[PDB]
Amino acid sequence: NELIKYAKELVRSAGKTLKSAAMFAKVLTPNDDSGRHGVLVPTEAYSFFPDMPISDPSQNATSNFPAFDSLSKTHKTLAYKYYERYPERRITRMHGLLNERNYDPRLTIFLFARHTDGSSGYYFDCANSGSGGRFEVLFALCFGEAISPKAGLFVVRPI
DNA sequence: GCCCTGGCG
DNA sequence: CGCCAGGGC
Numbered sequence A: 001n002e003l004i005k006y007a008k009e010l011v012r013s014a015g016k017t018l019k020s021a022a023m024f025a026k027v028l029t030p031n032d033d034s035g036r037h038g039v040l041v042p043t044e045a046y047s048f049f050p051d052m053p054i055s056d057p058s059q060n061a062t063s064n065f066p067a068f069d070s071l072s073k074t075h076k077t078l079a080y081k082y083y084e085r086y087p088e089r090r091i092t093r094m095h096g097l098l099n100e101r102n103y104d105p106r107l108t109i110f111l112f113a114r115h116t117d118g119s120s121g122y123y124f125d126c127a128n129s130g131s132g133g134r135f136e137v138l139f140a141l142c143f144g145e146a147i148s149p150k151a152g153l154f155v156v157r158p159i
Numbered sequence B: 001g002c003c004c005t006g007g008c009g
Numbered sequence C: 001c002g003c004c005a006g007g008g009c
Helices: A002-013 A043-048 A135-142
Strands: A018-027 A062-070 A076-081 A087-093 A107-116 A119-125 A154-158
Touching: A002 A018, A002 A107, A002 A119, A002 A135, A018 A043, A018 A087, A018 A135, A043 A154, A076 A119, A119 A135
Parallel strands: A062 A119
Antiparallel strands: A018 A107, A018 A154, A062 A076, A076 A087, A107 A119
16 A cells, blocks of 8 residues: 555655554645645635634734654644634744745645554645656555546545 | 735635 | 645744
8 A cells, every 4th residue: 555655655755654643745736835825724624723712813823733744754833823813823933945935736745643552643744846846656645536627625644 | 944914705 | 625825933
């Protein structure tokens, strides 16, 4: 299974071994980027991310969460933003690869894994369609070979 | 780098 | 909702 091999490889790159995992993968829309606009989180994907209490829906809120950045192979802190005026939620502080706009389509993959040692954690990977890019291979693993990539398209599902 | 807030169909 | 947009520091 090419998706399971990928997920296991991503966890092992952080020095853990995968017990189980969930994935949220999103083909970005042109407005999305690393954080000036962030990656907009579809409502159906809120439950994939950590609980962020919104104590007052009339006020902005913000949470951090740790995530292993696959491109840099280092642990990072992402920001999970609630902006009340829309209302909507964004991820920001992602890898700067996402800022380059001339190589669409772009993909983000988030993986939440339970580890065999009883720990758990988030993982992030991303890609575009430029020369040497990884969009096609990653899109095929997350979504299959039969469906068309489409800006905004996303999947949330167990591994 | 990441903040925040204007807007649209 | 899903998405477009842009100035501040």
